[PDB]
Paper text:
It catalyzes the transfer of an N-acetyl-D-glucosamine-1-phosphoryl unit (GlcNAc-1-P) from UDP-N-acetyl glucosamine (UDP-GlcNAc) onto dolichyl phosphate (Dol-P) (Heifetz and Elbein, 1977, Lehrman, 1991). The DPAGT1 structure (as reported here and by Yoo et al., 2018) consists of 10 transmembrane helices (TMH1 to 10), with both termini in the ER lumen. The active site is on the cytoplasmic face of the membrane, formed by the 4 cytoplasmic loops between the TMHs.
In the crystals DPAGT1 is a dimer formed through a crystallographic 2-fold axis, with an 1850 Å2 interaction surface. In solution, DPAGT1 exists predominantly as a dimer, as shown by native mass spectrometry, although the monomer was also detected. WT DPAGT1 has an apparent Km of 4.5 ± 0.8 μM and a kcat of 0.21 ± 0.007 min-1 towards UDP-GlcNAc (STAR Methods); Dol-P displayed an apparent Km of 36.3 ± 7.2 μM and a kcat of 0.20 ± 0.012 min-1. Comparing the WT and Val264Gly structures showed a small (1–1.5 Å) movement at the C-terminal end of TMH4b towards TMH8, which would affect both the dimer interface and the exact position of EL4, which forms the top of the Dol-P lipid-binding site. The entrance to the catalytic site, between TMH4 and TMH9b, is open and accessible from the lipid bilayer via a 10 Å wide cleft.
Residue numbers in the entry:
A (entry chain A), B (entry chain A): 7 to 79, 91 to 151, 162 to 405
């Protein structure tokens, strides 16, 4: 176990160097490829290369392809290693294809379930435990869970974005938490399930680190949806094949909140604008809250209920107004980023991200305290 | 053996239908993505979607992902099935990324060797025969062969192009030849190596058929380099893991000629222009030969030798001229397409491709006649 992990750490560090180096090397290619855009929360109108998650994702694959013989230098764990690499590779591919082509939201949800198929087949051939603990055999519903886990993690990361270094940053906190957890649980009982998880988590961390080097404020590159697809599948891969998917979903606490808080807007029960990202006040330099103003008559009975319950829960800022066109309701954009600006006022982009990363650390500490009996201590 | 092959044929036919249907469905996406271009050998200036090999390649992957449990419903042949799918998937990905980004020719040659790594690792873990028959153990040089085989097949297909339905068409003749060969050799001796090859060749044939449906004259879509990368790796995958790589390289006869005949121009020993494709005479409707005119003084001593030897072999048409700038030499563009126009005069695009496809059939018949003792018959 320490001998292949040493080799895995060496290739991961070479991969960090590789990502840091290749990202600015391909800058010209992405700009020429029209795979670039402006940073909307910035006064600068310069084009920044998009989908850089494709370069770190590619570096990740090559690193692991080289690593493949070392754990071996038994097949049951080897099939899962090649199978997991197929599922991740397919996802980086279909992820980048979705970035380049901008597929319909319905086709976007099918892509993660498509890429997760080899894991389901490996779990089938290697006779994986279809039973779950509250002792219940899910059988077919367990395979539906595995399929949907890839779809969840990607979109959970993808919905909690809009400020520089958030998507890559939250993934670093999550992967580092899994790394810490794997090491703690490596000492005894489940050694095989946590050594396997480390094999993917260490290269994922260091390639993402190299990406964050360029994505961090002030954003030099964008990660793109390719990164969210890549990250989401890597987390689903380790959680599924490591059997710690429940523990792993607890590291997704800020994402789960942000998702449910967003849900009334996403389902269009409460009016949703094109972009729910904060509005930068040029004179301040900091980011202010964004709003979704709409006609009160056009709002549904269910929507009027949810918006009144969320206002009474002290989560949404509601501003009533009346114009020549009629009466309009200015509802606060429902996302964790805008909720932090409601609670703490206007915050600068670099501090706002860092704060959400700290919030991600807090949740991980909460998970760890539950799992290891540290509630009495703290 | 017939039971999983039946299921493989069913999914392959559904895949044909899928490719035929999805290609025109995504037309809008590619045009908007600026992933489109004009057909240079045509008077029509309309933009035709590029890289459609990504859609057939994707359909291929999904088909095989569904197929994975059926041969099983033993691991040694399963590892190669998942391993081969990883190598092919990685290639479709890095292939499409190269289409979208247009990487340097030196990085383009590293991509196939990168994607072929899982096959090398599977061949390593599953203790593959490093020995070869003229009885010689190549050891390390055998792994270099496997790595370079992917690079060869892709580029061999990629260099023999320039007319509608050639790249997809030549791949259909090659894959159909391998299908026929697998079936002949399935009856006895090596059943496992040919049943494995069929598992990939049948889905490759029917997805390419669906692509050719739209690529065939008059080209509605372009296959892109994504297809050449995809095709090349699938042929290298089956040849390597099926151990019939020598027999398979004989089906690549028109490609091997076209490559070597092109070599003096590619290496720039003899001047090479931007495009060595035929020139369409608007009044004729047919395609005429293309030429590479250059200064005789700028031509190397080795280049003057090769061009004189190729002229004496009755392969290249050389036209000497003298202008105000000085004396210039108008050399014929060295490719199998232009050589066919030198021998048979101007030919229409639809007939020219069909003729090269027939030429590909001839070579396959030659290979089959050698392998099965049919020289006396014909």
């Amino acid at each position: 176990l320490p001998m292949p992990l040493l080799i895995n750490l060496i290739v991961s560090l070479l991969g960090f160097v590789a990502t840091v180096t290749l990202i600015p090397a391909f800058r010209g290619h992405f700009i020429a490829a029209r795979l670039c855009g402006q940073d909307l929360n910035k006064t600068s109108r310069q084009q920044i290369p998009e989908s850089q998650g494709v370069i770190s994702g590619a570096v990740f694959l090559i690193i692991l392809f080289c690593f493949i013989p070392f754990p071996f230098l038994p097949h049951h764990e080897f099939v899962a290693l090649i199978g997991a690499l197929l599922a991740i590779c397919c996802m980086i591919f279909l992820g980048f294809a979705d970035d380049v082509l901008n597929l319909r939201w319905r086709h976007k949800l099918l892509l993660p379930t498509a890429a997760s198929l080899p894991l389901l087949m490996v779990y089938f051939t290697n006779f994986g435990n279809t039973t779950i603990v509250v002792h219940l055999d899910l059988g077919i519903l367990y395979y539906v869970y595995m399929g949907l886990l890839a779809v969840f993690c990607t979109n959970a990361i993808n919905i909690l974005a809009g400020i520089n270094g958030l998507e890559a940053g939250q993934s670093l906190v999550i992967s580092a938490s899994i790394i810490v957890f794997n090491l703690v649980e490596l000492e005894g009982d489940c050694r095989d399930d946590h050594v396997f998880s480390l094999y993917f988590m260490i290269p994922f961390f260091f390639t993402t680190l190299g990406l964050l080097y360029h994505n961090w404020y002030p954003s030099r590159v964008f990660v793109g949806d390719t990164f969210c697809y890549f990250a989401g599948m890597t987390f689903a891969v380790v959680g599924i094949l490591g059997h710690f998917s429940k523990t792993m979903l607890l590291f997704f606490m800020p994402q789960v909140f942000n998702f449910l808080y967003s849900l009334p807007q996403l389902l269009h029960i409460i009016p949703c604008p094109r972009h729910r990202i904060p509005r930068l006040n040029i004179k301040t330099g900091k980011l202010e809250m964004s709003y979704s103003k709409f006609k009160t008559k056009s709002l549904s009975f269910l929507g009027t209920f949810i918006l009144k319950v969320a206002e009474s829960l002290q989560l949404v800022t509601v501003h009533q107004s009346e114009t020549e066109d009629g009466e309009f309701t200015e509802c606060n954009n429902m996302t964790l980023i805008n909720l932090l600006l409601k609670v703490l006022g206007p915050i600068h982009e670099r501090n706002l991200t860092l704060l959400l990363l700290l919030l991600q650390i807090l949740g991980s500490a909460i998970t760890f305290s539950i799992r290891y009996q540290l509630v009495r201590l703290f």
